[PDB]
Design goal:
mainly alpha, 2 helices, antimicrobial protein, peptoid, N-substituted glycine, maculatin, antimicrobial peptide
Length: 21
């Protein structure tokens, strides 16, 4: 639900940015 999304924000974060560096 919406709860699982709360963690998504914390993951990005440096999630995508990491793929760059």
């Amino acid at each position: 639900g919406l709860f699982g999304v709360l963690a998504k924000v914390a993951a990005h974060g440096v999630g995508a940015i990491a793929e760059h560096f």
